[PDB]
Amino acid sequence: NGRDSNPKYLGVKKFGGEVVKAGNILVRQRGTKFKAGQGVGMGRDHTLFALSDGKVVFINKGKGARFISIEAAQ
Amino acid sequence: RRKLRTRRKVRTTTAASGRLRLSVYRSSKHIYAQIIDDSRGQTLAAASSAALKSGNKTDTAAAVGKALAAAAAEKGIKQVVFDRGSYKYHGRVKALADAAREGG
Amino acid sequence: KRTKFRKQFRGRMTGDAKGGDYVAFGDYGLIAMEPAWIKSNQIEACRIVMSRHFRRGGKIYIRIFPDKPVTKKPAETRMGKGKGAVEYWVSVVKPGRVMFEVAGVTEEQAKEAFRLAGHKLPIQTKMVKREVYDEA
Amino acid sequence: QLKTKYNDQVRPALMQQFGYSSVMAVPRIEKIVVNEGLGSSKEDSKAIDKAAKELALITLQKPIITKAKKSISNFKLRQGMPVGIKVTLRGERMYVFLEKLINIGLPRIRDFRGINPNAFDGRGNYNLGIKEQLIFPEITYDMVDKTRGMDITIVTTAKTDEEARALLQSMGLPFRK
Amino acid sequence: AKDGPRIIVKMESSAGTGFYYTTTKNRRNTQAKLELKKYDPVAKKHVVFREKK
RNA sequence: UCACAAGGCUAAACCUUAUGAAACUCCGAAGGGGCACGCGUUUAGUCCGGGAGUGAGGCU
RNA sequence: UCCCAAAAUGUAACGGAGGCGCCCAAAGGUCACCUCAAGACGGUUGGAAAUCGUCUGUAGAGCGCAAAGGUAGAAGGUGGCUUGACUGCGAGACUGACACGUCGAGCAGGGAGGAAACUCGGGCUUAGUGAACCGGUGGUACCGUGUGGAAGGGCCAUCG
RNA sequence: ACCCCCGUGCCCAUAGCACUGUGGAACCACCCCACCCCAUGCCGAACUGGGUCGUGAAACACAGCAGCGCCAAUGAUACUCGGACCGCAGGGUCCCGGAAAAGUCGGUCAGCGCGGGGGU
Ligand SMILES: [Mg+2]
Ligand SMILES: [Mg+2]
Ligand SMILES: [Mg+2]
Ligand SMILES: [Mg+2]
Ligand SMILES: [Mg+2]
Known part of the structure; x- marks a missing residue:
């Protein structure tokens, strides 16, 4: 009644076809909404983040297994 | 039940390792022990006991490891890692290990 | 008429x-x-009416069921909360929605029972026959 | 421990009349399962050792205690606490306990014209209604505590109950007559 | 964080020749006798800490 | 998942037929957001530092 | 924590519902293995539910708690060893007016489990909390009013 | 080169299940025995260890098969960005693009690699 006014935040912090950097956060999530690909590490709270620097692109597989990955730039 | 293989396989990191995947198939007294790359659908070396180890049965373990090790160094290898299926450790598969590892 | 959960x-x-x-x-x-x-x-009203027209009708089919808890100002003002858990349960109707349907009775019995059912309704209504079969 | 009458006679029995595909097609015995009903209404943490004693003495094999299913229904129940005992019998030991019963404990029983012939496991397995624990050669009232009873399930590879009955019968299973 | 009449406790640490605190939530409830673990002081580490105060 | 209309079946279930949903979702737009490019016309933007006011809004 | 929240984020109400002020020396680390709820046939204490067996069985179960997400290749269910519920650090980011808050590769000292690649700076995550001040205690040896000490203070823990 | 088998990937249901016909000494599987390595909170069922005969039964492999799943058009619609209006209100229409869900027409019982073993 109503007694939670805090937003957390979530969403997706770095989208697809986006230049990223190493240590950036590509996503904030509750469970694993999508899992990590190559280039990607994952913290305690899930939260896919970047190992390397590059172009972050998305792979959406078969409805409910999804993946964020980092392809090279150079 | 068949999740043992899927577990042990998904455990081993394909890409982020950089290394290579040495499989083993222990089924009949015939075995495989083929060594696969991670990424490219291809396979690097792959020795086997598949034909004529000449009376050796599970003792051929060392041999089929030994062979592979040699056959490995041919293309060259940097510390490939061990992908088994269900089959865990000790006598049978540990000999293929102690052979192909330390034999190169 | 009323929902239990x-x-x-x-x-x-x-x-x-x-x-x-x-x-x-x-x-x-x-x-x-x-x-x-x-x-x-208004259904209960219409059910009891259409029924009080042809006894051993015997087909009265009410395809509308109310589950819409609505509320009311108990006595007064705004200092307070949302209120009135049980006031009344409506259903929601919208044109082409078929509220009632009957059979086993005449053409005229249907005409007139639907006419009596017409009043006691907050809404305009009307009656038809069957052209259309979509699924069955 | 037989296995000779197991092979031969049981197999061609159905091969010489209605025919059959192969020697491996013919039904075989997978395991014998002994489940000791305990706990709930009758539960003794002291008599656990009793039932385990008898059980371990009869089958030449150590018994294993079950648990609760993580349920609380109405009456006595909880997440876990021993509700009963289990012993699985396979191979030589299965046949030990089996000949033990059939050769001795089966004929010796109260008002015994047989055990129920009707379909037990539609898929071709078999169950038993064993009541008294004292009807065995391996358990008598010479040395005892109280009176209880055990349950036994027979698993076979039989495809139907018709292939069950005739199978288990030649092994010395009598039927209600 | 907060404290009062209650169970458990927070003790911290102490040990041979190192003088140091791990500062760890313990408990007196289910199992408490030894609060004992292995930890790293100003030494090479490699040393056992007895967390009973 | 909760609700629910008729019939069958021997009251859950189960099938035929038929619906409701802010806290249901097998599905799912129009639109919205981020990035890049300008492939196109435009003009504002950011940073440092001085001075503010404002922190009662109103209607459609 | 959901809904309201108009498919980014955010968003009010004396709006609609429900939790928290903990717990776990193992519910942590790692390694190794295990797979659920339910239904139908048959069984001794049963005869709605126990326990056993056969059969079906992407979850209809479980996850310490509220709920949402997430989970079956486990995050679930057992054991082996254990104490990374570490010390000195923090590339780079999410988030916030600030103050806080969160995620974190990689580096060293040193350990843990594994044969191994490796994982480990508490717990599937998201609540279990409280700036500053003034004090309690253990370490340190920086200041110390002429000087050498000591009192008092500082700095690292840390308790109220 | 072609048949086929064992391992292993990409694809992760238009590749899944059911019904099922073929396959046995090449490969696979049961079955085989196990004091001992190793293990079973009880049983070598599972791990695991020693090897054939035996059958291809069961499992796995291949093939027929579209009863079930799964994918699924065109047309038309629901809704809607923008533009312009009606009705006191609930609510509604017109122009203009975008445009589903479901259902029907259908579509399938996969496809693309790598290494090795054994046939013609
Ligand atoms: Mg305003
Ligand atoms: Mg939102
Ligand atoms: Mg929005
Ligand atoms: Mg003050
Ligand atoms: Mg408009």
Whole structure:
């Protein structure tokens, strides 16, 4: 009644076809909404983040297994 | 039940390792022990006991490891890692290990 | 008429009919020409009327069920909360929605029972026969 | 421990009349399962050792205690606490206990015209209604505590109950007559 | 964080020749006798800490 | 998942037929957001530092 | 924590519902293995539910708690060893007016489990909390009013 | 080169299940025995260890098969960005693009690699 006014935040912090950097956060999530690909590490709270620097692109597989990955730039 | 293989396989990191995947198939007294790359659908070396180890049965373990090790160094290898299926450790598969590892 | 289990509250909103045929379950139906709420009564009213027309009818089919808890100002003001858990339960109707349908009775019996059912309704209505079969 | 009458006679029995595909097609015995009903209404943490004693003495094999299913229904129940005992019998030991019963414990029983012939496991397995624990050669009232009873399930590879009955019968299973 | 009449406790640490605190939530409830673990002081580490105060 | 209309079946279940949903979702737009490019016309932007006011809004 | 929240984020109400002020020396680390709820046939204490067996069985179960997400290749269910519920650090980011808050590769000292690649700076995550001040205690040896000490203070823990 | 088998990937249901016909000494599987390595909170069922005969039964492999799943058009619609209006209100229409869900027409019982073993 109503007694939670805090937003957390979530969403997706770095989208697809986006230049990223190493240590950036590509996503904030509750469970694993999508899992990590190559280039990607994952913290305690899930939260896919970047190992390397590059172009972050998305792979959406078969409805409910999804993946964020980092392809090279150079 | 068949999740043992899927577990042990998904455990081993394909890409982020950089290394290579040495499989083993222990089924009949015939075995495989083929060594696969991670990424490219291809396979690097792959020795086997598949034909004529000449009376050796599970003792051929060392041999089929030994062979592979040699056959490995041919293309060259940097510390490939061990992908088994269900089959865990000790006598049978540990000999293929102690052979192909330390034999190169 | 009344629901036995729920979440207990609601909003409100409207758009064109979805969940009713032109016809099913009998020969002649009754269709709403206007969007509105129908109370637990007005059906009870219409059920008891159509029934009080032909006894051993025997087909009275009410395809509308109210589950819409609505509330009311108990006595007064705004200092307080949302209120009135049990005031009345409506259903929501919208044109093309077929509220009632009957059969086993005459053509004229349907005409007149639907006419008596017409009043006691917050909405305009009308009656038809069957062209259409979508699924069965 | 037989296995000779197991092979031969049981197999061609159905091969010489209605025919059959192969020697491996013919039904075989997978395991014998002994489940000791305990706990709930009758539960003793002291008599656990009793039932385990008898059980371990009869089958030449150590018994294993079950648990609760993580349920509380109405009456006595909880997440876990021993509700009963289990012993699985396979191979030589299965046949030990089996000949033990059939050759001795089966004929010796109260008012015994047989055990129920009707379909037990539609898929071709078999169950038993064993009541008294004292009807065995391996358990008598010479040395005892109280009176209880055990349950036994027979698993076979039989495809139907018709292939069950005739199978288990030649092994010395009598039927209600 | 907060404290009062209650069970458990927070003790911290102490040990041979190192002088140091791990500062760890313990408990007196289910199992408490030794609060004992292995930890790293100003030494090479490699040393056992007895967390009973 | 909760609600629910008729019939069958021997009251859950189960099938035929038929619906409701802010806290249901097998599905799912129009639109919205981020990035890049300008492939196109435009003009504002950011940073440092001085001075503010404002922190009662109103209607459609 | 859901809904309201108009498919980014955010968003009010004396709006609609429900939790928290903990717990776990193992519910942590790692390694190794295990797979659920339910239904139908048959069984001794049973005869709605126990326990056993056969059969079906992407979850209809479980996850210490509220709920949402997430989970079956486990995050679930057992054991082996254990104490990374570490010390000195923090590339780079999410988030916030600030103050806080969160995620974190990689580096060293040193350990843990594994044969191994490796994982480990508490717990599937998201609540279990409280700036500053003034004090309690253990370490340190920086200041110390002429000087050498000591009192008092500082700095690292840390308790109220 | 072609048949086929064992391992292993990409694809992760238009590749899944059911019904099922073929396959046995090449490969696979049961079955085989196990004091001992190793293990079973009880049983070598599972791990695991020693090897054939035996059958291809069961499992796995291949093939027929579209009863079930799964994918699924065109047309038309629901809704809607923008533009312009009606009705006191609930609510509604017109122009203009975008445009589903479901259902029907259908579509399938996969496809693309790598290494090795054994046939013609
Ligand atoms: Mg305002
Ligand atoms: Mg939002
Ligand atoms: Mg929005
Ligand atoms: Mg003050
Ligand atoms: Mg408009």
